[PDB]
Design a binder for these strands. Structure first.
Lengths: 122, 56, 119, 115, 229
RNA sequence: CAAGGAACUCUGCAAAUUAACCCCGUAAGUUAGCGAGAAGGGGUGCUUAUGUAAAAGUAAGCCGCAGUGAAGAACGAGGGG
RNA sequence: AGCGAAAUUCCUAGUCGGGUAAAUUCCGUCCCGCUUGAAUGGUGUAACCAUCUCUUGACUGUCUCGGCUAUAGACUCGGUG
RNA sequence: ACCUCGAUGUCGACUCAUCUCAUCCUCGAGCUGAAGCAGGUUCGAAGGGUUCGGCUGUUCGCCGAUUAAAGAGAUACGUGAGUUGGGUUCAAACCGUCGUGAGACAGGUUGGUCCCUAUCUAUUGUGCCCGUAGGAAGAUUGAAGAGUGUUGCUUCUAGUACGAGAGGACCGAAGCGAGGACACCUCUUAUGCUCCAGUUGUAGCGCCAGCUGCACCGCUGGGUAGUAACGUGUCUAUUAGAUAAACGCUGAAAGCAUCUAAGUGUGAAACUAUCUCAAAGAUUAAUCUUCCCAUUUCGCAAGAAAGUAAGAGCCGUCAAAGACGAUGACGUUGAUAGGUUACAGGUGUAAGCAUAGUGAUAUGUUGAGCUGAGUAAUACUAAUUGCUCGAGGACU
């Protein structure tokens, strides 16, 4: 499972390359990440040509996971890597173009803005 | 660990009280002679009514 | 703590049971400890059932468990078995051996057992 | 009075799929999945090769892998699951009933089909 | 408060797809219909309960005293005999079907002896952290921790009773609650229930009404579809 | 042995990772010798043919999921005293 | 002269800047240096470090978070003890 | 400095916690220069819990992410006959200082030996003997008991009330949750040392093919059950009594007023209950059902005779159990274990043959082949035609 101080790639228009977890938002000592969990992140690598700066701590949500979690349907989708998308202070995400597909495990939880910028939803 | 003081003889009797042994099974040879133990081959080299080996 | 007897190993166990089944197939009766007798008898019956069919591939399979004895050799023992022993047990559905408890051993007081076959 | 555990297979006979098509690993297939959202019914076609096929009767599971937008995704499926439709596209060959390399390989490494 | 119960054995574990479009795992419990061995009313016996017999056996076993007891009341020869509290609304020697007691949606409870684990360590029993292995793992690193709290003749001076320690864990009739019944097999007299059931295969289980609620049925419906081409 | 990689911890103490062969390539510093196996990259299976005295090699074909298939195989870089 | 919050600075976890999301320890720099100090040498200084430290890449069972398997032990029976 | 200097091994940290309440949140109440929201004061309340990182031997301290909340002390600033020796101050080396000097720092810096097989008590499970008034097989209640009952987010209620504007409820309902705990292995993970596939070399099977041993299970990849979760499912709840703080009615003494004095109540995550678990060694030894014998009867109840027939025990097969004991089942009349048979499941086209090729190889045979533990019919084999104790309702 993904955890704190886990640098993974970004999947929208930010200009960053890697970004690590610092703490999972919510009740204390959860210590276990899952799909759609909002987290606090710190960028690891970023070019100035983007819209992010090194050393800044912001808020993101993991969308694709190398670990994989089983959905209520009983069909378990996995990814070979971990992907996170930054969100600006609310349900609205900073980025406009998303790279790669997403899942539907957060459709019932809102986040329609992200899926409006996603090509495929599982 | 060493004791605070040497163990008493009656405490030794208590220790060896549950260490007491019991007897064991016995059975008359239904085909061979003198007694033997249950579910065993007799000195005559056979199981009950089952000649399988020489006595000696 | 450290370097000592390697201990009983599954490889040593299978080699030992192979040796014992070769010996009993050579002789017929084996007196040992009951713990080895009971678990040896299972593989012995399996090999006997395999040998109930005289086919070269089955011979290849059974060669994986045969060894060399002074009384019988693997080539000698296979022919001996297929000549006299295999036809006799061919009319019985399993249970091709008898394990009978011996008395406590003179060396370790363990309840030995003798395994025999062929009526 | 005896428990054969065939009753375990008997209680679930109401749940068996009708056609139950036969296949194995190394076969490319496009499975149809019904996305029922209570406001619109969406059918999604998910294509890919078989990774494994476990048995256990009612719990026959099989993993299918796709590579969309440079993103590999592997989904486990069961025939017995309602609202799922299985369609066979082509069958290849494999010297196993389980694969691990394909779970970590890339393009130009797929298995060719044999007539 | 009347509680209806039955005795059964866990014979298998399975799964199913139900309505609301979600897959659920199902415990398979063979529930033997029982015979009323007796009742104790809350007027002479000081409390109300019903003793049932189950696990039927032959006529050469069930030693002659208990055989004569059973024959005296014309009881079915059985191996096990247990009572259910607060139930008297039946008559002597009545055959009971779980269908008349349990439904397709009602939540129930099960008292079942768990799987025996024999001697288990405190960590395996109380689920505490294993000692660190870095910078010297130490000769012990998998043990009880410490109970050292008494120094001087006024702090503790001894250990308290019931202190957590390794020993026998499990193999006790634990009660699991709020198990949604999934289905009934009247022909084979079996039940399929949601959740999990403690104990090994064929473990003795007692299924009664849940004590978290009087028992309300819910629209549990099983989902099956048939594709054909 | 699934994941995260030092977060545990005085501190990557440890452990773990690299590795043998040849084929490319190899930074700064500088007392010019070293650095340096620097670093980092390519591959080593089988069959046939060509290869020279032998190999190393080259070409073609073939298989496995992975081919010094097992055992003997330096972790590295930057900075300070 | 040189060097200096240094194996030397109590005040001091001194000031500033850099890395560090977040660093009293790290680096450069400031020199009122209680009491730096020139052969018990002073400043830089290459190769070398089973010397010490800081940071980073891979690596992970050190860590969230433990679980699984085989022996030797433990225990059971014998002998000795 | 009064036990201790003929013995308390000591600080921080890890694991393990515990006690109390001068109470941090969750709970409630009173009041407020508190419109609501955001507040403050005081009290009751200990039921529960109250973080992870950076600096540092360090508590503290500072910063960041926070979290519903990051309480205050003590249990020898708990925890070494549980762990490390991480700081000092054995010795050794070095810097500045002090002294003329060996040396010292009431300075710092570098690397710098952690013993104990448990006798009792206490604890956990575990058993043997006996008792409970003849004995056995069972079912039970329960006097005292033990477990825990924590909390956040979202939506509706409802922008209603409120204020004007900004903003924004009390109470209630539903869903999602987090921490911890219980159980299981249908899925999914992790393994899977008598499962299989491949693969290298060696030494062998008189040689090839094909096999075995060795090389960590030789290696790599899977995989039956098994075990644990990182997996599922559930639990946290509901209700009642007495109540705390607090809120009252009537109502006096004290013609008034008055929650108090009598009577009457309302009222808390606190107590008792409800739920989970154990049980009559509960010696205060309780209740109930059945069965065995009671074949005059000498003796303080059957030995002047039958000395249970009920059962229990020794032994074997054993595993749902299990350190060993025990628990539970079966002993020829038996399915207890193994074998046979077949099934499930796994590996995944055996060996061998023929064809094409110069050959590795590929094709048909071939879903063949085999498969430790799982599944059931099966007396085929092993559980002997074996043995020991054990009856007279005690007395009133």
């Amino acid at each position: 499972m993904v955890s704190f101080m886990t640098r993974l790639n970004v999947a929208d228009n930010t200009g960053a390359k890697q970004v690590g977890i610092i703490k999972v938002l919510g009740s204390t000592r959860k210590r276990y990440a899952f799909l759609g969990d909002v987290v606090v992140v710190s960028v690891k690598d970023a070019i100035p040509s983007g819209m992010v700066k090194k050393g800044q701590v912001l808020r993101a949500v993991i969308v694709r996971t190398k670990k994989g979690q089983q959905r209520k349907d009983g069909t378990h989708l996995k990814f070979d890597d971990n992907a996170c998308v930054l969100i600006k202070e609310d349900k609205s995400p900073r980025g406009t173009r998303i790279f790669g597909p997403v899942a539907r495990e957060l459709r019932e939880r809102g986040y329609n803005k992200i899926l409006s910028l996603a090509v495929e939803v599982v | 660990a060493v004791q605070q003081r040497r163990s008493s003889k009656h405490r030794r009797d208590k220790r060896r009280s549950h260490d007491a042994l019991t007897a064991q099974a016995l059975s008359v040879c239904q085909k061979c002679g003198k007694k033997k133990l249950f579910h065993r081959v007799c000195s005559c080299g056979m199981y009950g009514d089952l000649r399988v080996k020489k006595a000696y | 703590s450290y370097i000592n007897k390697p201990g009983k190993t599954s490889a040593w166990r299978v080699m030992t049971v192979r040796q014992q089944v070769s010996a009993v197939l050579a002789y017929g009766k084996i007196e040992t400890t009951l713990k080895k007798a009971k678990n040896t008898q299972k593989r012995l019956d399996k090999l006997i059932t395999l040998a109930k069919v005289d086919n070269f591939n089955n011979r290849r399979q059974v060669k994986k468990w045969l060894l060399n004895t002074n009384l019988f050799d693997v080539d000698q023992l296979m022919d001996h078995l297929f000549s006299k022993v295999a036809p006799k047990y061919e009319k019985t559905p399993g249970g091709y051996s008898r394990v009978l408890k011996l008395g406590p051993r003179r060396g370790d007081a363990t309840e030995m057992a003798i395994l025999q076959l062929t009526d | 009075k005896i428990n054969k555990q065939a009753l375990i297979d008997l209680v679930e006979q109401k749940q068996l799929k009708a056609y139950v098509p036969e296949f194995s690993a190394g076969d490319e297939v496009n499975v149809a999945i019904k996305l029922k959202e209570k406001e619109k019914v969406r059918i999604q076609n998910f294509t890919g090769t078989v990774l494994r096929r476990r048995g256990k009767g009612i719990s026959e599971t099989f993993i299918v892998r796709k590579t969309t937008d440079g993103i590999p995704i592997e989904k486990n499926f069961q025939i017995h699951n309602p609202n799922i439709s299985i369609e066979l596209k082509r069958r290849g060959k494999v010297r196993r009933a389980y694969i691990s390399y394909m779970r970590e390989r890339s393009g130009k490494a797929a298995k060719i089909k044999e007539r | 408060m009347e509680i209806r119960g039955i005795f059964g054995v866990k014979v298998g574990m399975s799964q199913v797809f139900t309505t609301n479009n979600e897959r659920l795992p199902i415990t398979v419990i063979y529930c033997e219909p029982n015979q009323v061995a007796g009742v104790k009313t809350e007027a002479k016996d000081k409390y109300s309960a019903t003793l049932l017999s189950f696990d039927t056996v032959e006529n050469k076993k069930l030693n002659k005293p208990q055989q004569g007891f059973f024959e005296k009341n014309n009881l079915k020869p059985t191996k096990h005999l247990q009572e259910i509290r607060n139930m008297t609304g039946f008559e002597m020697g009545q055959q009971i079907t779980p269908q008349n007691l349990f439904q397709v949606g009602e939540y129930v409870d099960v008292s079942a002896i768990s799987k025996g684990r024999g001697f288990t360590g405190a960590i395996k029993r109380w689920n505490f952290k294993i000692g660190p292995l870095g910078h010297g793992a130490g000769y012990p690193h998998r043990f009880q921790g410490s109970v050292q709290a008494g120094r001087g003749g006024a702090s503790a001076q001894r250990v308290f009773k019931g202190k957590k320690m390794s020993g026998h864990y499990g193999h006790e009739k634990v009660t699991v609650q709020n198990l949604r019944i999934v289905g009934f097999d009247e022909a084979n007299m079996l039940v399929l229930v949601s959740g999990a059931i403690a104990g090994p295969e064929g473990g003795v289980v007692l299924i009664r009404t849940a004590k978290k609620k009087p028992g309300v049925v819910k629209p549990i419906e099983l989902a099956v579809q048939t594709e054909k081409a």
